[PDB]
Structures are given as C-alpha cells and as structure tokens.
Design a binder for this molecule. Structure first.
Ligand SMILES: Cn1c(N)nc2ncc(-c3ccccc3)cc21
Ligand SMILES: Cn1c(N)nc2ncc(-c3ccccc3)cc21
Lengths: 10, 242, 233, 11
C-alpha cells in the first residue's frame, strides 16, 4: 500500500 | 471537462492551483555540513511533495485518470516538477538558487554536498535561460502541467489507449493555451511557434536535470548521508534505480 | 551564416542528403556477452558515421571544435536511439538494430527496450515523416548540450538561430502536408515532447552502458569508451 | 577526450 496512492485520495 | 475549458479558463485554473512557497528549516546557528544541507533539501522536497499532490489534482484532465496512472505520472515527474519550480523562483536571482525564501544558495554553498555542483550549474543555467527569454507565469504553469502529463505517458489493455489518448488531448489543449498566450502577448505567428519550440526544448534539459538529480539522491541514500522520508524513499524507488 | 540563408526545402534536402547508411551487424544462440558485443560493435561503427553527418548538419561546422565535441559528447546516444526508434517504426514489437539484427523483448536492458518500443509505437501512431525525423534529429544535436555551455554568448545565439530555422522547417513540412495552424502547433508540440522521452532513455542507457563497462563483460571501442567518459566527468 | 576531436577534423 504505497504512500502516494493514499495521499491521492485525501 | 478539461477539453471544454477555454484558453483563459485553462490559465485561470493553473494559476489558481499554484502551490505556496515553503520555508526551509534553515538553522543559521551552525555552518553547513554535507549531511545538514542535504537534510534541508530533502526536508523541503518532502513538504513540497504533499502540496504537489494536491496541485496535480487541480491540473485539468488529471483527476480523470485511475489512481495507478496518477501514481505513475507523479512518480515519473516529481523531481522535474520540483526543479522547474526552483528554476522559476530563482529567475530574478542571478547566480543563486532560491530553494526557499530563507535558503538562497550559490554554487559556492552546495560545495559541501558531494556531486551537487554539476546539477547546481545546470539549474542556474536553466534559470538564466528562462530569464533571458523572459518566461511568464502563465507560460510557466503551462510548462509545469505539460511535464506532469507528459513524462510518464510513454511508459503507459483497452482502457489503456483511451487513457493515453485522453492525456494527449489534454496536452493538446495546453499547447493551444501556450499559443493563445503568445498571440495575446503580441507575438507574430512565426515567433509563436519559435517560442513554443524553445520552451518545449527546455523540458529536455529538465528531464535531464532530473535524471542526474535522481542518481545523486540515490547515492546520498546509499551512503547513509541523510534519512529520507518514507515518501522520498518510495519516489526514488519508482526510478528503480541503481 | 549559410544555415540562416537556406530555405525550408533546401534545409530539408540538405538533411536527407546527409542521412547516414543503415549499417549491418555481424551476419548459434546469443550469450549476454555476444548480444551486447553486436550492439556496441554496431554503435561504434555508427559513431564514425554520425560524426560525418553532424558536419553536414547546416550550422554545425560554423562552431568551434570544442563545441562540436561537446555537442556530440552530449547527444550521441540520443541520436543512436532516435535512429533505432525511427528504423523500428514499421516493425511493431521489434527493434531493427540492423537488417540482420531485429529483436523483440522475448541484464536490465528490458526496461530500456520497452521505452524504445513505446517511442516507436508513438512515431507510428503519429505517422512520423522522414523529413520530420531528420529535423528532429538535428534539433537533438544542436539542443542537448547548448544549456551546459562574448566568444560564447554569440555561439549559443548562433545555435538558437539555427534551431529556429529547423523549427520553421518543421512548420513548413506540416503546412505543406496540409495541416491547419492549430494542427501544426499541436503536432510540433507532440514531436518536441518525445525528445524529452528520448533524453530520458539516453540518460538511462548511459548508466546501463556504464555497468556493462565496469563489468568487462563486453569490450568497448576507444571511441565508445571516451564518449562514455564524458558523461561522468 | 581526443579521438572525437580528431574525427571532427578528418576530411
Ligand atoms: C538538486 N537536488 C538533488 N540532487 N536532490 C534534490 N532534492 C530536492 C531538491 C529540491 C527540493 C526543494 C526545492 C527545490 C529543489 C533538489 C535536489
Ligand atoms: C542501452 N544500451 C547500452 N547500455 N549500451 C548500448 N549501446 C548501444 C545501444 C544502441 C545502439 C544502436 C541503436 C540503439 C541502441 C544501446 C545501448
């Protein structure tokens, strides 16, 4: 679960 | 949609999505070390990335894409994006790199970072170029949006070719926008496409500054010179580097 | 001076006229060492030729030798790659390194291979024209190393003037092919932006060529070695 | 540095 991926949903 | 945006609406959005200039953790009580300075740049970048992500989302067309794709574009362009910003804000600062309002360095100061100077020279060079052409803000955000869509599009089953094609359509609008701008700036037709060429050619040197930037970072990493954020680690990773 | 007096069509005819020959490779299965041998053997020979084409790139002989050296030291691998890409176009899923050496993606060079193939997929999807390709190729030569440059300001000035010509020439080509103004600009943009992807493949290959160097797995010519020397120094 | 130097003079 890459960091960037989650940051791109917040 | 981004394709029904006009030129002037295209420009308004981008200027409106522009990130803030962030300050460095600059501690003027000690002299620079290699480790310290690098710390400062990697701390700054780390914080710019978070804002960057939010900027990308406001780049027209960009939210139309799957997360995996957004992830990829960003992983490809992040350092180009940081460097083109740095160059831009360094514009009116001859001989110096304005990483932050409280971190304005010259080629003499990056001295203590092994291998940084070459990249410093390049960036100051790009800045003198933008200065000499008289790069405008409206043109800068266009370039910056081009870099974000472009850099990783080549490196994109059936939903793939629609996504590609989508990005190409969007890049075409920004091209239409760059021209709009120059026309409005009172440029002749000839001067428009000459200018458009000169700026797009500048991206080649920015891709190039990035690649050298990346490899230098990997060696600070591989030397345990500076701790890198879990985000930095991951973005440097993407470049599967060595 | 003479480069700034050429016409759109004289520019084009001079560049098609300087176009290098498609050289051949060496004529069981491949070892790692054997494969890269053919590539670097090929590349070396192609270098000798590329130097002669550069001298016939209008504007190029107007410069000093330091500066041709520097331009060629920066551009060389980009030049090679856009040739392979251009030659590979009409062979979907394959790289035509030479007529006898036509490979598919079937250590580390695979990522590079995938990029070159994508570049060729692009050129294909755009239907790049030959006249367009030779222009792009000259742009690469004069562009790549000018940033990293009143003896000097004039020379840059010169190269940038030659570059606008090649760009005028690219536009001629597309107006001639009957595209609207909007489409000339879009198109011009699309082709310049590929150079960014080419500069990127080249920076990557340079590093891969640097490990294939440190490895002593593959002899490299004294030229090939010096040209790789320039990218570290 | 030099091989390339000499090729660019060769005629
Ligand atoms: C030259 N450089 C390298 N080698 N690694 C780097 N990481 C980040 C930056 C950066 C960070 C914030 C603003 C401007 C530049 C610059 C870097
Ligand atoms: C990726 N790569 C490495 N590492 N060393 C290389 N040497 C030559 C080429 C080459 C030569 C002619 C056409 C296209 C590529 C590519 C190379």
């Amino acid at each position: 679960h890459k960091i960037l991926h989650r940051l791109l949903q917040d | 949609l981004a394709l029904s945006l006009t030129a002037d609406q295209m420009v308004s959005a981008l200027l409106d999505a522009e990130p803030p200039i962030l300050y460095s953790e600059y501690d003027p009580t000690r002299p620079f070390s290699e480790a310290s300075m690098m710390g400062l740049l990697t701390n700054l970048a780390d914080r710019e990335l978070v804002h960057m992500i939010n900027w990308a989302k406001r780049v027209p067309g960009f939210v139309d894409l799957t997360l995996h794709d957004q992830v990829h574009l960003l992983e490809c362009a992040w350092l180009e994006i940081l460097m083109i910003g740095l160059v831009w804000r360094s514009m009116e600062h001859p001989g110096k790199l304005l990483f932050a309002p409280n971190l304005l360095l010259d080629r003499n100061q990056g001295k203590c970072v092994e291998g940084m100077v070459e990249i410093f020279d390049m960036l100051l060079a790009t800045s003198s170029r933008f200065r000499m052409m008289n790069l405008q803000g409206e043109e800068f955000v266009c370039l910056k949006s081009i870099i974000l869509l472009n850099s990783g599009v080549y490196t994109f089953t059936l939903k793939s070719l629609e996504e590609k094609d989508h990005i190409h359509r969007v890049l075409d609008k920004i091209t239409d926008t760059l021209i709009h701008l120059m026309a409005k700036a009172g440029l002749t037709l000839q001067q428009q496409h000459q200018r458009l060429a000169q700026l797009l050619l500048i991206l080649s040197h920015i891709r190039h500054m990035s690649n050298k930037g990346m490899e230098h970072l990997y060696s600070m990493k591989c030397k345990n010179v500076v701790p890198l954020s879990d985000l930095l680690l991951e973005m440097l990773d993407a470049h599967r580097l060595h």
